[PDB]
Design a binder for these strands. Structure first.
Lengths: 273, 256, 236, 40, 55, 177, 109, 256, 40
RNA sequence: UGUUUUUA
RNA sequence: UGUUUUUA
């Protein structure tokens, strides 16, 4: 593939350097149009700028603390952190969010990696060989209410069991109702004065509940679970203006009041280098 | 062989737009608007294609461009909800699908200076000014032919109106990634942007959801000659095309 | 020996993965197959079967009466019944369609709604079955209802009407669990003319309501139902 | 060789060698040639 | 596979919407029988409703 | 002081001879370029190569006239302090007329095949400047400043590699709905 | 082809050998260098990162990342024509950086 | 088939000149600049052809055209003696040969009035103001990029500066016999004159001898609109082409 | 058999059997033969 | 022919 | 032909 063609002096009524940007078109003007050029080759395919490479590597999306301890005399196992629930979203960790939000619609198969790591901050004699259950709870399915509820049975729900310290890895096909996920939704659930803007179930990947299936030991062991998401077979539409200001909420384009200027003010005038 | 690309005529239905200072029309993503094909269709109901009774130019109430104007934003199909038969069909049907020919008009003398950015943003999800997880209320996102004036004050439950941040936390300079055209008064008096139907679904509710958002933003401020009225009218004219409606039904009631 | 590298997610138990495994009974011969009628390959076969809707969902306890939609004689321009079309909820929850639907997260396609008249043969009635696509409220009068998809039903020798609820959706799939965005709309029935009863007959006659799937029906993303529960593992 | 029944199980597709920047760079109705007057 | 066929106005003595459920049969009545329909395709195999997947 | 629309407007002043319009280094992952789409995408990568496309659009009256000289200064030399210095490098003399826009390509002028996106001295791209070639002449009954719009885009010979996290976004706390 | 071997030691009183997971994060020039052990940086949305158990090892290949056609083992030159600039040292050999943390929370020991 | 002869682009080396109000370029004596052929060559030394490092547009420091400006004169190759690599080669070599693309620039509004005569005079031997047999001194004939301002005062050993007499005792009106172009502000903002190498010898000393002289002379005086600055900048941009140097040698020292 | 997409993932190339010590041992303009007077 | 598909 | 490539 040719990068630069050979081009000599130009004395022409065709002025490739003159155009009208008022047209909204970016004319493919080359160095060969402005200067005298030598022949060069690309030696480059552009493999790393493909959306599958750009959007298609693993990223931390969720981190959660859960405790394996005695469940006696506890009324809410979700809030005592015997299990925690995560409404699946890629909009909670901003670095990945910005990448996805370069586009309006994205259709990808997912590949999750869950890494559970234990810690016994208080007196412990040993490192317990805990097994975490990661349970996929799609909308409508009974969300677990107790750490050993009938829900965890997962007779129809997808579920993964893996040892703490070790990891789980499972693929998930594109689960969107539409032909693509909406990174942005300029609309409502219905025509209602108080209904939620932007937030829609078009992006309801589902939920993930995490428990340690082990019974309690005498010591408290804190398990920090980290969910990693990798997009595969990525298709992306409608490129957007990159995010400039920081986020405030999941699924909202909201930015903080009194936020700092993002355009990097010069030292000196417009003439400075 | 002589003629001109600045002199254009668009005839849709019984409506005709002419321009003598046109910049080359933009066709968003090089894709012309088309009826939904059977291979992409989900809804089984035979779609009403209303032809020339709706596929015509509706001119929107003019805006006044001053030296201190920040800009204006319209939502589609929202802006055309009160426009003739299109609006009626919009409210009588559960599902709607439409492309648009947007035509923005701002004429001035050869002594005038200023540049408008006319840009079409698909899924222009607005940001609340209250920050946090505060929602933008239905009434503010669906203003109608009035649109949103970005020079105005904020309202409780209303959107953020700092044109610099595109009302969404992105920078103004980058809007050029979206299908856009400038009205540079020295060059151009009319922008035109043909919008196809852009959605993740083949057809959608026209009332609850706005597919695209038209923004007209002064970049280079209006500089009028000495002794002139420090104002120019900006007139927006929109024509639906390849419009489809499905699931006819009792007229939908919306807020306000 | 072949050099290998174990990927992450090694030694994980995933309840969905369909892998080979060692048989604990080698060389065991399983009992021969014989012909049994009523073989089910797919749930989409049986979900196409009509089951009664407890539309008269107005009783203190579950009753047979709950399946009986009351008709009243000499009522003009009046509602017979009304329901939303969350098929994984309300009147539909307990039906075979509802029960199977609740084992899944997404549904698409057309529903088949049937009414069977059980009044005297010498009685006469015209009813209008109206489907209201989403975006509009449930119709509060007949004139409102008839603006949507409707079947005017003349009750005669053929006892049953079959109104198909056409798949009217923008998004290709709806949620089985009640969700506002993926609302299917409303179903209503009205007196088109009236119920006229023969002499020497009094009181209420009844409709039986049926729901079934059309062959264009779709279900995906399996899930646990909330239609059954337990606190304790069972014993014999 | 794919070890699974599901398409979602497969690896990434690598690269779409098919580019066309024109749909973003030149989304114009009338054709504009480099060198020709943009407007006439 | 066709999901919905194209079907226009009907003025017919064949009333696919009228039946007798007393027969114990569920007549395969389609949207094409009650409304005017456009052509749509399934794009769907029914893989997840197979008993091997269900059970 | 704050981000403004004015920040996109390069001021031109009438009756200025042999004077600078603007000046910038060509660290495209920094400075004026940081916030542009080019800059934003570039910052997702460690290495860049190829030619940049720099455009100026004039927004003054149609009855105004100006000639500007856009000058690219390859690395190794300082940013030009005068026009005579600037014009020794790669430059386009721009006559402002019916065509509102000039498109000056910054030719890939480098010894090493790839430059760093992050400001590095060895892989400096050089400097870009604009000067009054003649002057800005405004018609009667017009006063004050007119403005240029500046655009940046990549040429099709552009290259990016070695993906990296941007420093254009940050968080202390994981977000909630 | 890198091989990272992490080995633990509890020189003070400890009841057990913790099952720590080390994160090795590749930080190319320009990318935000981690500032805190659980900073947003470690997210590695675009940065290459490896997680492996202490006692065990990681093994990953890296292509030739040099800007030039070859790395310079020797560079008889400067970054620029400056009286005080660094001799020999040049980014021609900037392979990048590697940051190492233990992703585990703390124990008592 | 449409386009324009007023819109021109000249690309030489890394330099590009554009104009949108050009009058048809003049090629002196219908002869394009060319390298010296072997049949005309005298010097046996292989000539250095410096290519794009010297064959590029050098812009000369702008002049100010007032109502009372008489004109300006440049000598070539003298004017380019301090210009980049061309100047160095000029001083390092005994012999030099070069053609030129002269590009004179003077933009104004449609309200401005005035006409410049841009003329190239081969062997423009200047006259002394002292008369008799008085010589014009080296320093005055070799001013450099500054050129000679004819509106200035006379200097001892300097040339005569009455523009009417072309500094040589010929009348101004007759300069049109020389390859020339007008910058008529109503028509034109740019003159262009491609000069071939003109000499009685195939190659010559570039330091002691000026082959051609560029004169820019206001004929119709500058009449600015009411309230305007009574000045216009005139910018001269010159590009050597088909440049040849021979007899490389220690750098020549010249007066001043 | 390579288990990866990347060339960097592959094993070492073994041996370049192509030697030529001449470029280091005999980097001379004129050819010098063993036995012939080195200079003449 | 108050006819339903398919193709230009 | 003030012509641009390709090959000896």
């Amino acid at each position: 593939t040719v990068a630069s063609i050979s081009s000599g002096p130009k004395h022409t009524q065709k002025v490739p350097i003159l155009t009208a940007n008022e047209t909204g078109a970016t004319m493919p003007v080359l160095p060969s149009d402005s200067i005298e050029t030598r022949t060069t080759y690309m030696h480059f395919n552009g493999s790393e700028t493909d959306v599958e490479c750009f959007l298609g590597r693993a990223a931390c999306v969720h981190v959660t603390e859960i405790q394996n301890k005695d469940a006696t005399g506890i009324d809410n196992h979700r809030e005592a952190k015997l299990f925690n629930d995560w409404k699946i979203n890629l909009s909670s960790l901003v670095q990945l969010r910005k990448k996805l939000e370069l586009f309006t619609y994205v259709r990808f198969d997912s590949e999750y990696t869950i890494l559970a790591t234990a810690s016994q901050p208080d007196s412990a004699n040993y490192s317990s060989n805990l097994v975490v259950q990661a349970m996929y709870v799609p909308p409508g399915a009974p969300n677990p209410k107790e750490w050993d509820d009938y829900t965890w049975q997962s007779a129809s729900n997808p579920s993964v069991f893996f040892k703490v310290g070790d990891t789980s890895r499972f693929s998930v096909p594109y689960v969107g109702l539409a032909s693509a996920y909406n990174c942005f939704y300029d609309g409502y659930s219905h025509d209602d004065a108080e209904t939620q803007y932007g937030i829609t179930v078009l992006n309801h990947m589902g939920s993930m509940a995490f428990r340690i299936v082990n019974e309690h030991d005498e010591h408290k062991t804190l398990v920090k679970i980290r969910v990693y998401h990798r997009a595969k077979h990525v298709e992306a539409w409608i490129p957007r203006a990159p995010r400039a200001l920081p986020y405030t909420s999941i699924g909202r384009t909201n930015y903080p009041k009194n936020t700092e200027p993002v355009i990097k003010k010069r030292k000196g005038d417009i003439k400075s280098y | 062989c002589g003629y001109s690309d600045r002199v254009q005529q668009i005839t849709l239905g019984n409506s005709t737009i002419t321009t003598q200072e046109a910049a080359n029309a933009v066709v968003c993503y090089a894709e012309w608007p088309e009826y939904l094909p059977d291979v992409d269709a989900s809804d089984v109901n035979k779609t009403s294609k209303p032809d020339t009774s709706v596929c015509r130019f509706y001119t929107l109430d003019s805006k006044t461009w001053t030296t201190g104007s920040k800009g204006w934003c319209w939502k589609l199909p929202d802006a055309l909800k009160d426009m003739g038969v299109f609006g009626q069909n919009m409210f009588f049907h559960s599902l709607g699908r439409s492309g648009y020919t947007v035509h923005v008009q701002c004429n001035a003398t050869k002594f005038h200076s200023g540049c408008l950015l006319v840009v079409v943003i698909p899924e222009h999800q607005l940001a609340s000014h209250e920050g946090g997880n505060v929602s933008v209320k239905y009434t503010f996102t669906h203003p109608g032919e009035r649109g949103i004036d970005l020079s105005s004050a904020n309202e409780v439950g209303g959107p953020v109106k700092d044109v610099i941040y595109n009302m969404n936390g992105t920078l103004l300079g980058n809007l050029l990634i979206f299908p856009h055209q400038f009205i540079n008064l020295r060059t151009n008096n009319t922008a035109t942007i043909v919008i196809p139907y852009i959605n993740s679904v083949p057809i959608d509710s026209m009332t609850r959801h706005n597919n695209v958002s038209l923004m007209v933003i002064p970049i280079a401020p209006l500089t009028v000659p000495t002794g002139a009225t420090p104002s120019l009218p900006i007139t927006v004219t929109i024509a639906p095309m390849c419009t489809e409606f499905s699931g006819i039904r009792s007229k939908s009631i919306v807020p306000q | 020996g072949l050099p290998t590298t174990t990927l992450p997610g090694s030694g994980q138990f995933l309840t969905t993965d369909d892998r080979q495994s060692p048989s604990a009974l080698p060389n065991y011969e399983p009992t021969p197959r014989i012909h049994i009628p009523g073989k089910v390959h797919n749930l989409l076969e049986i979900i196409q079967v009509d089951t009664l809707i407890p539309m008269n969902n107005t009783h203190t306890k579950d009753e047979v009466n709950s399946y009986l939609i009351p008709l009243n004689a000499n009522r003009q321009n009046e509602q017979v019944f009304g329901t939303n079309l969350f098929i994984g909820d309300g009147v539909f929850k307990t039906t075979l369609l509802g029960e199977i639907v609740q084992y899944y997260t997404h549904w698409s396609g057309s529903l088949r709604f049937s009414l069977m008249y059980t009044g005297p043969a010498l009685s006469s009635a015209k009813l209008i079955l109206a489907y209201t696509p989403p975006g509009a409220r449930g119709p509060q009068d007949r004139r409102e209802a008839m603006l949507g998809t409707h079947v005017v039903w003349d009750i005669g020798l053929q006892s049953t009407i079959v109104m198909t609820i056409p798949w009217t959706s923008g998004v290709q799939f709806r949620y089985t669990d009640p969700d506002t965005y993926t609302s299917a709309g409303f179903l209503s029935c009205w007196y088109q003319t009236s119920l006229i009863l023969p002499p020497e007959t009094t009181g209420q006659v009844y409709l039986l309501s049926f729901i079934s799937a059309c062959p264009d029906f779709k279900l995906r993303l399996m899930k646990d139902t909330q239609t059954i529960s337990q606190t304790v593992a069972l014993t014999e | 060789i794919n070890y699974y029944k599901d398409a979602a199980s497969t690896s990434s597709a690598g690269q779409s060698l098919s580019m066309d920047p024109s749909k973003f760079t030149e989304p114009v109705k009338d054709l504009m040639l480099k060198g020709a007057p943009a407007l006439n």
